[PDB]
Structures are given as C-alpha cells and as structure tokens.
Amino acid sequence: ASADWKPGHAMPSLFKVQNVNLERCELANYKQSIPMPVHMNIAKYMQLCQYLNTCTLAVPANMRVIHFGAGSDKGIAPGTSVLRQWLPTDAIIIDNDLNEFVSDADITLFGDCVTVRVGQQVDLVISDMYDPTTKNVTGSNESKALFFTYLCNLINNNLALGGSVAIKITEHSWSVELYELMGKFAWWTVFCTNANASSSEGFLLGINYLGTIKENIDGGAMHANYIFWRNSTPMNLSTYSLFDLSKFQLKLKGTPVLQLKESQINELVISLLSQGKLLIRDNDTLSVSTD
Amino acid sequence: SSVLSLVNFTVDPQKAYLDFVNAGGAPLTNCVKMLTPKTGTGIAISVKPESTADQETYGGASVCLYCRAHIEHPDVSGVCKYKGKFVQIPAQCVRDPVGFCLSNTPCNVCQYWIGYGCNC
Numbered sequence: 001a002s003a004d005w006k007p008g009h010a011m012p013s014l015f016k017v018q019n020v021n022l023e024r025c026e027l028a029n030y031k032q033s034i035p036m037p038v039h040m041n042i043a044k045y046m047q048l049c050q051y052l053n054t055c056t057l058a059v060p061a062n063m064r065v066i067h068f069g070a071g072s073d074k075g076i077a078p079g080t081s082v083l084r085q086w087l088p089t090d091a092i093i094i095d096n097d098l099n100e101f102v103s104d105a106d107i108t109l110f111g112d113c114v115t116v117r118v119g120q121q122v123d124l125v126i127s128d129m130y131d132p133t134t135k136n137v138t139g140s141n142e143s144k145a146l147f148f149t150y151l152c153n154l155i156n157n158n159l160a161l162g163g164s165v166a167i168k169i170t171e172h173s174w175s176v177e178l179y180e181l182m183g184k185f186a187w188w189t190v191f192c193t194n195a196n197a198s199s200s201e202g203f204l205l206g207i208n209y210l211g212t213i214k215e216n217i218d219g220g221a222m223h224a225n226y227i228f229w230r231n232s233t234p235m236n237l238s239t240y241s242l243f244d245l246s247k248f249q250l251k252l253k254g255t256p257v258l259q260l261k262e263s264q265i266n267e268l269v270i271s272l273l274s275q276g277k278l279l280i281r282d283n284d285t286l287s288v289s290t291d
Numbered sequence: 292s293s294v295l296s297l298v299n300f301t302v303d304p305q306k307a308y309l310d311f312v313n314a315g316g317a318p319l320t321n322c323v324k325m326l327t328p329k330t331g332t333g334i335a336i337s338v339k340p341e342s343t344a345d346q347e348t349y350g351g352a353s354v355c356l357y358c359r360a361h362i363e364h365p366d367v368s369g370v371c372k373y374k375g376k377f378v379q380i381p382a383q384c385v386r387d388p389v390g391f392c393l394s395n396t397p398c399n400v401c402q403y404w405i406g407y408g409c410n411c
C-alpha cells in the first residue's frame with residue numbers, strides 16, 4: 001500500500017491534459033474521518049510540508065512566509081505551529097485570519113486578507129482560506145472571486161521570482177484566474193493530503209514563480225480536470241507518512257537572494273529560478289501591516 | 292472558555308488558573324500538540340521540538356495563559372517566553388499543559404524543567 005505511506009496524491013499530467021466538462025465531485029469516502037493521535041490540521045499541514053519537501057522550494061535565510069486563513073474557531077493556529085516546526089529557525093512567519101487567534105507566528109494580523117499590506121515581496125504563500133458562503137451551492141459551479149482576487153494580485157506583485165505558493169481549493173472554492181497563474185511558475189500541481197483524502201480539498205501549488213507565462217492554462221477546463229482526477233482516483237485516508245518524522249524539517253538550502261532588473265534575466269537566471277536555486281526580490285527589511 | 296473568562300476577573304491570573312484547576316476546574320483545552328520524533332534533547336523551551344520519549348511538544352503560544360487569554364504578559368520585557376517557540380511537557384502532565392507551565396520554572400542554568408529533567 002505504497003500510497004498510504006506517501007503524504008498524499010499530486011495531480012498527474014495524465015489528467016492535466018484531459019478535456020472534459022466540469023462535473024459534480026463524488027468521492028466514495030466523502031466526509032469519512034480518520035482519527036488522530038492532536039488537531040486534524042496538524043496532520044494536514046505536515047503532509048503538505050512533506051510534499052513540499054519533494055519540490056524545488058527556494059529556502060533562503062530570513063525566509064519570508066505569509067500564511068492566510070491561519071485561525072480556527074478555537075482561537076488557535078495548528079498549521080502555523082507546523083510551519084514553525086518545518087521552516088528554518090530564522091524564517092519569518094506572518095499569518096492572518098478574519099477572526100481572532102493566537103499563534104507562533106512572528107506577525108499576526110486580524111481581519112480580511114485584503115487588509116494585509118505586503119510592502120515587499122515574499123518567498124512562500126500558504127493559504128487555507130475558505131469562505132463559508134461557498135457551502136450555499138445554488139446552481140452552476142462557477143469560478144469564484146472572494147479572496148482569490150487578492151491572492152492573484154499578490155502573486156503578480158508581491159511574490160519573489162523563484163517563490164512558491166500553496167493555496168487551498170475545493171470543488172466549489174476555486175478560481176479560473178488562479179489556475180491560469182500557475183502557468184507562470186516553473187511547475188504546478190494540486191496536492192491532496194492523505195489525512196483529508198475524503199474531501200475535495202486540494203492545495204494548488206505553484207513552484208518557483210517566473211513572472212512570465214510558461215504554460216497556457218485554461219483555468220475553467222483545468223478545474224474540470226482536477227475534479228475528473230478526484231472522481232477517477234481512489235484515495236484512502238491515511239497518516240502513515242507521519243510515522244517517521246526524522247527528515248521532516250525543510251532542507252536548509254541557503255538559497256541566494258539577488259536583485260536583478262527584468263532586462264538582466266537571461267536563460268541562466270530562469271534555469272536557476274526553475275531549480276529552486278535562486279530568488280529575485282528586495283533584501284530590505286520586511287514590512288507587513290494592516291491597512 | 293469559562294476559565295478564559297475567569298482570569299480576566301483577577302489581579303493574579305497565574306494563581307486564578309491554578310486555584311481553578313486545583314479545585315476540579317476543567318483544564319484549558321485545544322493546546323496545540325505537535326507530532327515529533329521523540330529524539331529531542333528534552334529541554335523545556337526550544338526553537339524546534341525537543342521531546343524525549345517521556346515528553347510531548349506543544350506550540351508555545353497555545354500553552355501560554357497570557358497568550359490564550361489575551362492579557363498582558365508579566366515578563367518585565369513584555370516578550371512572551373513561549374510564543375513562537377516549542378514547549379516540552381512531561382507525558383504524564385498532558386492533561387493540563389497550561390497548568391504545568393504556570394506551575395514550573397525552567398532551570399536558569401540548564402534550561403531543563405526543574406524537577407523534570409534538570410540535574411543541577
């Protein structure tokens with residue numbers, strides 16, 4: 001049962017290249033829950049981090065990480081603590097949520113993510129945001145605006161070249177524009193944790209931002225492919241991947257941060273960015289506040 | 292969230308919580324318990340999880356009464372000693388991580404819990 005020992009499943013190119021209508025998502029184990037030893041979001045975030053351990057993430061000193069939707073109705077932030085456990089000790093974590101919470105982040109901002117002003121560019125964006133109104137399924141499942149408009153503008157303006165994102169989507173919480181922006185990364189996928197395999201949740205991953213269109217993606221068709229994949233792929237609830245945590249921490253890659261004019265970006269630079277070997281952004285002092 | 296309300300009605304939140312739990316009050320729940328390779332050093336407070344086989348590791352802010360209750364921290368510098376860090380709790384005390392932290396002090400010389408690891 002090899003896949004049970006993996007942290008989850010990543011959308012394969014087999015389904016990326018399909019051309020299908022958007023259908024209802026029908027999971028055989030829908031809403032089935034696996035017991036924890038420990039909040040469920042501990043297992044969920046750890047498995048996301050384990051999969052990102054296999055991606056070409058840029059990991060610099062003073063790494064800039066912003067974590068949206070970090071709070072829970074319990075006033076705590078299990079995912080932010082997992083990020084603290086995963087990331088380098090000198091990484092800067094900023095988290096945010098609509099509702100009050102306390103966390104192990106360096107900076108915690110309350111309110112709509114739209115109020116979060118990122119003055120500089122960041123290296124990694126994690127979003128677990130989900131709007132409760134999405135559960136009011138009436139009629140056609142269309143592309144959603146909501147917080148995705150903010151996130152898309154963030155990717156276009158406040159994400160370092162070489163930076164990455166992991167953005168939670170579901171069958172009904174998704175964005176045409178966000179899928180299309182994945183084509184501006186060196187690589188992309190949707191990752192579904194084994195801890196939450198019974199949900200249509202997935203983390204849309206963009207790995208190494210290039211600022212230019214590498215893959216032309218029809219976002220509406222690609223979400224239809226994501227649902228087609230989920231409808232076609234048995235996924236058993238499992239946290240076996242968390243049984244051995246000896247290599248859980250993010251590798252301390254020491255990725256360099258360089259300032260370059262866009263006219264200076266040549267094939268060597270794009271190659272380094274695409275391998276997780278370089279970031280291009282400011283090296284100012286990071287300033288992230290509420291507006 | 293009852294005890295969380297209670298420590299807003301007192302001048303000594305530490306004593307208020309401890310008297311409450313010591314008289315049968317339900318300990319604060321939802322402390323953020325990590326999954327760790329129990330191969331750590333075992334010190335009290337650490338930047339990364341350091342649980343031994345006899346310990347559990349918690350996210351620091353979640354076991355801090357002053358963090359959880361959104362009240363002023365007593366540290367003269369105003370910085371919380373747990374927030375942004377990890378706190379190791381003896382495995383037999385996971386019933387009340389917050390009470391254990393309010394009831395004990397790390398060794399000022401070896402930073403292990405006095406009585407639970409500190410051998411000085």
Ligand SMILES: C[n+]1cn([C@@H]2O[C@H](COP(=O)(O)OP(=O)(O)OP(=O)(O)OC[C@H]3O[C@@H](n4cnc5c(=O)[nH]c(N)nc54)[C@H](O)[C@@H]3O)[C@@H](O)[C@H]2O)c2nc(N)[nH]c(=O)c21
Binds near residue numbers: 030132135
């Ligand atoms: C996939 N699916 C959907 N429906 C039907 O379509 C609706 C919309 O789905 P929707 O897109 O939420 O996705 P899912 O319910 O996975 O999301 P799931 O609830 O996992 O969503 C997961 C996320 O919800 C979020 N969430 C739960 N707690 C909170 C909270 O307290 N606040 C906020 N804002 N969000 C929360 C959180 O991100 C959590 O991980 C569903 O509600 C069903 O009616 C399905 N029906 C059947 N029979 N079989 C299915 O397989 C099926």
Ligand SMILES: Nc1ncnc2c1ncn2[C@@H]1O[C@H](CSCC[C@H](N)C(=O)O)[C@@H](O)[C@H]1O
Binds near residue numbers: 129
């Ligand atoms: N527009 C928005 N701005 C900030 N947070 C938002 C938001 N829309 C939804 N959210 C947040 O999305 C979150 C989904 S549940 C988050 C669980 C959390 N990651 C954990 O570790 O437990 C909710 O807290 C909700 O308040």
Ligand SMILES: [Zn+2]
Binds near residue numbers: 352359364
């Ligand atoms: Zn505190």
Ligand SMILES: [Zn+2]
Binds near residue numbers: 398400401409410411
């Ligand atoms: Zn000592």
